[PDB]
Amino acid sequence: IEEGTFLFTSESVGEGHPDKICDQISDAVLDAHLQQDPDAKVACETVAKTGMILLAGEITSRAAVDYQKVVREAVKHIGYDDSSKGFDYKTCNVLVALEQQSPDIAQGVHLDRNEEDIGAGDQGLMFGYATDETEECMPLTIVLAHKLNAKLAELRRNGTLPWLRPDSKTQVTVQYMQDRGAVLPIRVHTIVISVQHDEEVCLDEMRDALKEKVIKAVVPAKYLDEDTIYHLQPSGRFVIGGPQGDAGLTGRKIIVDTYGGWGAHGGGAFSGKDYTKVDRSAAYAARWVAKSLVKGGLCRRVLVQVSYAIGVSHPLSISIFHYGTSQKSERELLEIVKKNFDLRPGVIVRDLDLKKPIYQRTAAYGHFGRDSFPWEVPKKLKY
């Protein structure tokens, strides 16, 4: 029997996954610049590889930044500090290939303009999405996936599971049922967890620990039953992880960073980018809008699209899809959005306080669904 049921799955990766190392390093570099120069123009790409971190991209800033220190301190905090773990901050190669921002981009975007008039730093499309299925207005699949990795990191850093290393991958498969445009998560179907580990600890001590200390502490019992499949350390000997024998890049976990397959994505990455890059600021803005609509009671689920042209301040297009979860028309919801939001980057930066150096926080465990971020605090709407 089936009705209108389906499976959906989302992954998250821990801080030590090579791609997410790059994301966090790029955001550490951005924060370092914003501490001294709030108007810094940053486009930092990081590359992680056996024994190597390379910084490539472009930065115009008044800050004096010691790239060797910021990169190595980041790798330190992530937990790579010895050969035994496959990577050491003290002894890794750090190359830097950073130049100024193209003057052609500067003149065309932000030079000699009032803040509210600065153009989009690029063309692009960005999506925002919210769903009433969790308190945090996010898909349960991605939320559980993130929180599992966060738990592993927690239990690693407070010594309670000292055999854990920084690299990890989780996949949460939830069984869903459609409900008049909304989606009801019914049960957790499958949970996969691969995590990098000590030489000493035996396989089934880890597996016991992943179930009893990680999953039990994270996933409400209401979603777990006797049929739920657990794939804990499925391959077995995952002692080799992180950059060693692997190659990661900034912006190769954009789906993990956002909605875990749900809603939509326009393909712009977040990390290493100041507010003038609308891939970040407009995506943050669009999440804010989507969450505001659902928390404001105007719909149970929603997807928002916005687009920009480089050097132009106002969005080229804005669109709302409520999946038929609102009594009001999508056009009416658009009218409400137009009245309550100003989606130019020069304004978004004020409303969301995006010159603050708090970006490294966002580089793991997802950019959405968390308490402290301005874009997760819904706006009271007037209509």
């Binding site: 389906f6 459609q178 409900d179 008049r180 445009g181 989606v183 998560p185 019914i186 049960r187 409400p220 209401k222 979603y223 039953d225 939509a264 997807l303 899809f321 409520h322 999946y323 038929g324 979860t325 009594q327 999508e330």
Partner: protein, 304 residues
């Protein structure tokens, strides 16, 4: 944290959902259960399994139980069936723990010949549905003298599917103006909101905590009298649609002998105690059915 516990059976169904909602929010510690599709919000409980019913009631220590039946009326052929009985067990174990059981029953226990009907009036069901609802009252009342019986007419509410209410099933036939549709203009009925019935269930239960004299039969119903045909026209009027494709059949249906013509319930006893809520049908059905508008349904997909 609230200390006032309640157990709603048939919490998965239209009525149960509304009841569990009305309680939970207003400082009750509301738990719901159901046979199928209960998880994750409610407990998986087969009322016909006495061991299951025993354990959940033993472990929960409810101060009140509201016994609803899931329901999905095609019924409204009007023949069979039920093997319950399980209202007996529920009544048994409600007493063992000392919980006030409210038994939801129907106006189909009556003849529908001399309306209105009082709580005192002699029942006379023309069908097997009416029969078992009447048996349940007997089976409950004689297994628990501290229990109550709330009789209610046809139901509607914020359904998850059109088929969950015999009022809401009509909505597609209303919407599709290009096809003519026949509907009963013979049987007299009183559509009643489960949200209203839920409020009544909370008010009645909250009285029994003060006054132990609350027991026996009670009647609630919406005040607006409507046929199946008049309801359909009221639905079109709410959503501002044409109803001329709707044709009334004043002749009784194929099994008109099994259907009570007008089983109007007299709600005077319950009106006296300050118990009662009546959402107007034109406002109630609008809030109920808007998600099932053709244009909304087209949009209700997983992905854009």
């Amino acid at each position: 944290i609230p200390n006032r516990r309640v157990l709603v059976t048939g919490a998965t169904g239209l009525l149960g959902r509304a009841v569990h909602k009305e309680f939970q929010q207003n400082n009750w510690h509301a738990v719901g259960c159901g046979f199928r599709r209960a998880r994750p919000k409610f407990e998986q409980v087969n009322l016909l399994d006495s061991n299951a019913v025993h354990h959940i009631i033993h472990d929960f220590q409810p101060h009140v139980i509201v016994h609803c039946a899931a329901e999905r009326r095609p019924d409204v052929d009007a023949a069979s069936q039920l093997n319950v009985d399980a209202s007996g067990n529920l009544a048994k174990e409600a007493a063992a723990v000392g919980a006030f059981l409210i038994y939801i029953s129907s106006d189909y226990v009556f003849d529908g010949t001399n309306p209105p009907y009082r709580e005192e009036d002699i029942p006379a069901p023309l069908n097997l549905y009416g029969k078992t609802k009447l048996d349940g009252e007997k089976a409950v009342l004689e297994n628990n003298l501290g229990a109550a019986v709330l009789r209610i007419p046809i139901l509607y509410g914020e359904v998850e599917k059109l088929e969950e209410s015999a009022v809401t099933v009509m909505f597609d036939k209303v919407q599709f103006s290009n096809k003519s549709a026949n509907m009963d203009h013979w049987q007299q009925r009183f559509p009643t909101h489960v949200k209203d019935v839920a409020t009544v269930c909370r008010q009645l239960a909250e009285k029994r905590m003060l006054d132990p004299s609350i027991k026996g039969t009670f009647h609630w119903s919406g005040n607006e009298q409507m046929t199946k045909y008049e309801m359909a026209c009221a639905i079109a009027d709410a959503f501002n649609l044409p109803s001329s494709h709707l044709r009334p059949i004043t002749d009784s249906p194929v099994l008109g002998a099994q259907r009570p013509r007008n089983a109007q319930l007299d709600c005077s006893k319950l009106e006296t105690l300050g118990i009662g809520q009546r959402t107007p049908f034109r406002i109630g059905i609008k809030e109920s059915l808007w998600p099932f508008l053709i244009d909304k349904r087209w949009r209700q997909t997983v992905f854009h």
